[PDB]
Design an enzyme around this catalytic site. Structure first.
Site, short mmCIF file in Angstrom:
data_model
loop_
_atom_site.label_atom_id
_atom_site.label_comp_id
_atom_site.label_asym_id
_atom_site.label_seq_id
_atom_site.Cartn_x
_atom_site.Cartn_y
_atom_site.Cartn_z
N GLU A 35 0.79 -1.43 -0.07
CA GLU A 35 0.01 0.02 0.15
C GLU A 35 0.78 1.31 0.00
OE1 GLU A 35 -3.23 0.56 -0.62
OE2 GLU A 35 -4.12 -1.53 -0.15
N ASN A 46 -7.49 9.34 -5.98
CA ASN A 46 -8.24 8.52 -7.01
C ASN A 46 -9.36 9.23 -7.77
OD1 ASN A 46 -7.57 5.99 -5.49
ND2 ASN A 46 -8.59 6.82 -3.84
N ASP A 48 -12.47 9.02 -8.12
CA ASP A 48 -13.78 9.72 -7.36
C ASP A 48 -13.56 10.82 -6.60
OD1 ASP A 48 -12.46 8.44 -5.17
OD2 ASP A 48 -14.16 7.30 -4.51
N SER A 50 -11.65 11.01 -4.05
CA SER A 50 -11.12 10.60 -2.66
C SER A 50 -9.49 10.63 -2.79
CB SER A 50 -11.50 9.18 -2.08
OG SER A 50 -11.20 8.26 -3.13
N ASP A 52 -6.31 8.37 -0.57
CA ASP A 52 -5.60 7.45 0.27
C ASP A 52 -4.69 7.92 1.14
OD1 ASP A 52 -7.53 5.52 -0.93
OD2 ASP A 52 -6.26 4.64 -2.19
N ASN A 59 -8.85 5.37 2.92
CA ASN A 59 -9.53 6.21 1.87
C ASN A 59 -10.55 7.11 2.63
OD1 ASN A 59 -12.46 6.28 -0.02
ND2 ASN A 59 -10.52 6.00 -0.93
N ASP A 101 -15.71 -4.31 9.27
CA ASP A 101 -16.91 -3.74 8.77
C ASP A 101 -17.63 -5.22 7.84
OD1 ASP A 101 -18.87 -1.78 8.24
OD2 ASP A 101 -18.10 -1.68 5.83
#
Ligand SMILES: [Cl-]
EC number: 3.2.1.17
Length: 127
Positions: A35, A46, A48, A50, A52, A59, A101
């Site tokens: 990562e 990213n 969209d 967003s 990271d 995110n 989650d």
């Protein structure tokens, strides 16, 4: 900071990630390697809108709030900026929420593609 492999393994272990939610320590070390390359300040934007953030590339659409991401949910209830600390506490605490989650470590694209299904224990070997 840039962690060494065994250095990060030991820190992640002290922060309770070994076997957390079913994921042995080497999973978490492999995930960090691919990562962020073990850099606590890594960031990646990213498509969209967003970003990271940090050692585990958390995110800003779902997990942390960076104030510039549409559709923010801030499910870790943490500013993304705290995830760029050299101290891994906030990133670990949010990672624990993410992995709880309901989809395990699949939230981490690099883990899913580059770690899952390999012998991840190799990432703590020699430590
Ligand atoms: Cl922020």
């Amino acid at each position: 900071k840039v962690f060494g492999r065994c250095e990060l393994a030991a820190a992640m272990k002290r922060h309770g990630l070994d076997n957390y939610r079913g994921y042995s320590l080497g999973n978490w070390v492999c995930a960090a390697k691919f990562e962020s390359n073990f850099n606590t300040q890594a960031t990646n934007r990213n498509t969209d809108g967003s970003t990271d953030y940090g050692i585990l590339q958390i995110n800003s659409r779902w997990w942390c709030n960076d104030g510039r991401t549409p559709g923010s949910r801030n499910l870790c209830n943490i500013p993304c900026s705290a995830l760029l600390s050299s101290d891994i506490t906030a990133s670990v605490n949010c990672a624990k929420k993410i992995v709880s989650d309901g989809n395990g470590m699949n939230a981490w694209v690099a883990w899913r593609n580059r770690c899952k299904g390999t012998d991840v224990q190799a990432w703590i070997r020699g430590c």
